[PDB]
């Protein structure tokens, strides 16, 4: 859609067959007059070696779309690769939970043991005295 | 006269119009506001004693398009009270429609706003912000709308359109119940620790200060480090940070403030660097006084450091003394 | 800063700057402008800024340098029995 | 001659009121994140401990009655230096019952 | 579940602040 040299909707495109991109014809041609070399990668390149963009051959295409089953094959890997990466955001999260849980009910079982044992001193205090 | 004459007024409609012909020719001498402003009210008036009379609402808008016609924010003090009668009229939102209009073509339609949207409360939001396209009090008023709705974040929001407003003044006015509010409410802190950075642009300081003590503490006396009253109490959390950095501090304070470096230095030798802070107490003693002399005196009696010293001292203060009075 | 920039070259003349600044900062880093003077002072005339240094050294730790800036077999001997006992050393030795 | 300072002092310790409440009043709520149960309360019952925790969790959220509020922060944390006293084998026995709890 | 774990670990160590007391008041009726 454009030139890579000028900028603008190039109205001869030639594809250069040693940087892989699209150049007004008129444009890179003076290029290659300047000198013998492709403007991107700054490789050799002669004006044969430019080829003009093209109708495929003999079987016909349709633009690109939602349709197309090479376009919907890709757009699978889109949303498998998407909804991926959405169970490490629960792996990852699942894995601080339980590990707060763990150290939650760790000081739950620790705590628990001393909640038992006041229980038991502070009403055998009250055994004791209310006897004396 | 027009008022003693509608006093005066059986054919009162004959000193009405009388009072309009009135209108048509004192419009001549106006080339306005209060002469414009009474003229629409008593045009109004006139229309009001119509209504009274169910003579109305019609003419009363005639002698408003006559107020259209005046050739101004007292004008709109005449919109506002075309409006004012028209949401008394029993079509609230009609007339809201005209100075709309009005303002649409485009300002006094604003305080009837205030006089409006004060009650319109009791979804207001817009309709308060139509305001700010056109007042610091009415400003956290509607915050603390919007808090009593406690939508918290969203208010903090307005102090920020607040202040890009109202420059290093009135600003201030908005700034400190909006910092003492904002570290109320979160107490993350880059966030507020940014917001004291745009705020700084004397009590402020403090704040911060207080912040930063308990939520990095040196950093907070490199602020503090950044008047008299300012430099005892750098000294005070300094000193929270451990003594030794206070007598370190007076070095500072140095460049009354005299009787504070003599504060500082009282318990710094006095409890003990330790010769450089005695001879600093003498070049303290000796910057600019007889409790100062029981001072030295104390510390020449506390050795168990000699008269020589003493006497020298003594002499010094008196050649002190002497500068003193040779003074004018 | 013009008073400071006012270039010190030779004894007398840095020393003749020196009362100038010095007393235009006590007019108005009280410590660094104070140590910056001692080190003009004492990089000098080195007979009279003996006498010129310590005349303004207990307007401006001064047991030590009063010691070092006095150096006199009868002002030990006065010592003995303390900024008048260096001036007395400083202008008879 | 206090000025602007009483000001300043008073904002300073409304503002280390504010700290003090918020932090003691819950770590659950104030960390990150339920409807009113009386006879959720009443069946889980029908064992003192697990009352206590419902009378709690009931008070702190204000079919829904409130009441409880006064029951500071100095008798929590000797309280809560006290337990942790009580308290390479503490830590392989927690990574197996959280693999338990986890099957 | 766990948000209910951290409910009753903070109302248990209120309730401890109760049983010290109890123990406390115990501590200086045998003591008389």
Redesign the interface.
């Known amino acids: 859609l454009i030139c890579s040299i000028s900028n603008e909707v190039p109205e001869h495109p030639c594809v250069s067959p040693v940087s892989n991109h699209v150049y007004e014809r008129r444009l890179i041609e003076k290029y290659i007059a300047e000198n013998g070399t492709d403007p991107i990668n700054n490789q050799p390149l002669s004006e044969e070696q430019l080829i003009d963009i093209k109708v495929a051959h003999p079987i016909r295409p349709k633009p690109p779309s939602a349709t197309s089953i090479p376009a919907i094959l890709k757009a699978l890997q889109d949303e498998w690769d998407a909804v991926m990466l959405h169970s490490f955001t629960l792996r990852q999260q699942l894995q601080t939970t339980r590990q707060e849980l763990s150290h939650a009910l760790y000081q739950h079982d620790a705590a628990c043991r001393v909640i038992a044992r006041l229980t038991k001193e502070v009403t055998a205090a009250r055994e004791a005295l209310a006897t004396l | 006269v027009d008022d003693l004459a509608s006093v005066w007024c059986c054919g009162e409609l004959e000193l009405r119009h009388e009072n309009y012909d009135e209108a048509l020719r004192l419009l001549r001498k106006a080339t306005l506001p209060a002469r414009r402003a009474e003229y629409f009210d008593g045009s109004e008036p006139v229309q009001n004693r119509v209504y009274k009379s169910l003579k109305w609402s019609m003419l009363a808008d005639l002698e408003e398009s006559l107020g259209t016609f005046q050739s101004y924010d007292r004008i709109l003090d005449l919109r506002i009270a075309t409006p004012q009668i028209v949401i008394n009229y029993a079509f609230l939102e009609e007339h809201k429609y005209f100075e709309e209009s009005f303002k649409a073509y485009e300002s006094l339609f604003k305080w009837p706003n205030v006089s409006d949207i004060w009650s319109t409360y009791l979804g207001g939001r817009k309709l308060e912000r139509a305001r700010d396209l056109f007042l610091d009090g009415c400003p956290p008023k509607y915050a603390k709308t919007l808090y009593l709705l406690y939508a918290q974040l969203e208010e903090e929001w307005g102090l920020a359109r607040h202040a890009m407003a109202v420059y290093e003044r009135a600003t201030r006015a908005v700034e400190p119940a909006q910092q003492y509010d904002m570290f109320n409410i979160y107490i993350a802190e880059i966030y507020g620790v940014t917001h004291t950075r745009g705020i700084y642009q004397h009590a402020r300081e403090m704040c911060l200060r207080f912040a930063d003590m308990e939520c990095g503490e040196i950093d907070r006396a490199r602020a503090i480090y950044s008047t008299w009253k300012d430099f005892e109490v750098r000294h005070g959390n300094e000193d929270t940070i451990k003594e030794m950095l206070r007598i370190r501090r007076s070095v500072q304070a140095t460049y009354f403030m005299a009787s504070q470096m003599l504060k500082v230095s009282g318990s710094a030798t006095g409890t003990v660097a330790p010769g450089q802070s005695g001879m600093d107490d003498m070049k303290l003693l000796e910057q600019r006084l007889a409790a100062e002399a029981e001072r030295d005196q104390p510390l020449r009696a506390q050795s168990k450091l000699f008269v020589r010293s003493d006497a020298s001292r003594e002499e010094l203060a008196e050649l002190a003394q002497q500068v003193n009075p040779e003074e004018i | 800063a013009n008073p400071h920039n006012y270039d010190a070259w030779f004894d007398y003349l840095r020393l003749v700057e020196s009362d100038a600044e010095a007393e235009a900062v006590r007019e108005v880093?009280?410590?660094p402008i104070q140590e910056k003077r001692h080190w003009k002072r004492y990089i000098y005339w080195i007979n009279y800024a003996l006498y010129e240094e310590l005349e303004a050294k207990?307007?401006?730790?001064?047991?030590?340098e009063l010691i070092p800036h006095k150096k006199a077999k009868m002002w030990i001997l006065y010592?003995q029995?303390?900024?008048?006992?260096t001036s007395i050393g400083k202008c008879p030795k | 001659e206090e000025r602007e300072i009483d000001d300043t002092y008073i904002e300073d310790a409304a503002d280390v009121d504010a700290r003090k409440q918020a932090i003691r009043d819950a770590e659950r709520v104030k960390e990150m994140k339920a409807v009113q149960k009386d006879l959720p309360r009443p069946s889980e019952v029908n064992l003192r401990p697990l009352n206590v925790e419902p009378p709690l969790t009931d008070l702190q959220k204000s079919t829904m009655l409130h009441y409880d509020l006064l029951h500071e922060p100095s008798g929590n944390k000797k309280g809560k230096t006290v337990g942790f006293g009580t308290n390479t084998y503490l830590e392989h026995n927690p990574y197996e019952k959280f693999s338990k709890e986890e099957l």
């Open positions: 880093n009280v410590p207990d307007p401006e730790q001064a047991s030590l010592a029995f303390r900024a008048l006992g």
